[PDB]
Amino acid sequence: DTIIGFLGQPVTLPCHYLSWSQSRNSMCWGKGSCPNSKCNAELLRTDGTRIISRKSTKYTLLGKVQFGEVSLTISNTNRGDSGVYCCRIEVPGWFNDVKKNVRLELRRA
Numbered sequence: 001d002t003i004i005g006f007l008g009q010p011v012t013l014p015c016h017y018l019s020w021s022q023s024r025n026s027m028c029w030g031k032g033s034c035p036n037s038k039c040n041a042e043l044l045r046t047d048g049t050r051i052i053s054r055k056s057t058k059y060t061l062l063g064k065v066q067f068g069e070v071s072l073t074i075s076n077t078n079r080g081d082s083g084v085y086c087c088r089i090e091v092p093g094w095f096n097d098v099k100k101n102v103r104l105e106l107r108r109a
């Protein structure tokens with residue numbers, strides 16, 4: 001997946017976990033491709049119901065976390081926001097987290 005967005009404007013990087021369970025799941029977004037464990041350069045983390053942690057108010061989730069609507073919205077993009085991002089759905093048990101890399105390209109307005 002490559003998302004194309006405009007500089008100075010927001011973008012939404014898509015990430016969905018259809019069978020999300022409030023008592024079982026959690027997730028994080030990070031900058032760079034997903035490492036073996038957790039998120040590198042974490043930008044945002046949820047528990048089962050809500051955002052519990054955030055790098056800054058530049059990053060948010062517009063959808064419902066409870067229903068696995070965990071697409072990341074990045075306000076007011078600049079060139080440094082370009083590149084690969086990691087969306088990581090944390091799943092109970094071992095070696096089974098759903099990891100996904102999303103590339104973001106940005107163009108001049």
Ligand code: NA
Nearest residue numbers: 091093096097
């Ligand atoms: Na796991």
